[PDB]
Paper text:
Pivotal to the survival of both tumors is the canonical NF-κB pathway that becomes constitutively activated by the virally encoded protein [name]. Taken together, our results are the first to reveal that [name]-induced NF-κB activation pivots on the formation of structurally specific [name]–[name]γ multimers which have an important role in rendering the kinase subunits active through a process of autophosphorylation.
An [name] [name] mutant was generated to maximally disrupt the [name]–[name]γ interactions and a D102R E104R [name] double mutant to disrupt [name]–[name] contacts. Rather than eluting predominantly as a monomer (preceded by a small dimer peak), the [name] mutant had an enhanced dimeric component comparable to that of the monomer in terms of UV absorbance (left). The tendency of this mutant to dimerize was confirmed by native mass spectrometry and shown to be reducing agent dependent since treatment with 10 mM TCEP resulted in a shift to a predominant monomer when re-investigated using SEC (right). These observations could be explained by the crystal structure of the [name] mutant that was refined to 4.2 Å. Whilst all mutants appeared unimpaired in their capacity to associate with [name]γ following immunoprecipitation consistent with our biochemical and biophysical assays and were expressed at similar levels, [name] displayed significant reductions in its capacity to phosphorylate GST-IκBα(1–54) and NF-κB activation. The fact that the [name] mutant appears capable of forming higher order species based on our SEC data, the lack of a clearly defined hetero-octamer coupled with the defective oligomerization observed in blue native gels suggests that the [name]–[name]γ assemblies capable of activating the [name] kinase are structurally specific.
Author numbering: 0 to 117, 124 to 170
The structure:
Amino acid sequence: SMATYEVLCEVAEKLGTDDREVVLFLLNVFIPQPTLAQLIGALRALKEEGRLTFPLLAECLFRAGRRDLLRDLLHLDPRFLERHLAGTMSYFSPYQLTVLHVDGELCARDIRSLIFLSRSTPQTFLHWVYCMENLDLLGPTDVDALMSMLRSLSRVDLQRQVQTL
């Protein structure tokens, strides 16, 4: 299965300011605070270098939290895809899935404190994680740079799920 170029444009229009950052992270190619041109520009490069398969995008929208779109553009049943991607193995790494979950369990007070504690990561948790990818501090092998930043913030309860995944 493969992601159609025409469908890819319809997904980029219906993606909000905050959703953009999440999708790009799950697809590996990430650009912080992206415009419509920047979002389609990365998507076109994945569907041109064969990487953008149909179930990679179907799962990408199911994991991002946009279950409305599966039945809108992809014409899939999100209830069947939910029951399907449970027994089926996930396209994404448990490191990509952990970062996305840690993102959701963060508060506005913590996200501002994140910046003042640590280019200089403009108002994004995924933007800070992207810095560590280039600065060799966060990776699927090493997540202790995040564990220290979690303990030294307030969310000490998130270190248990992180230590697992």
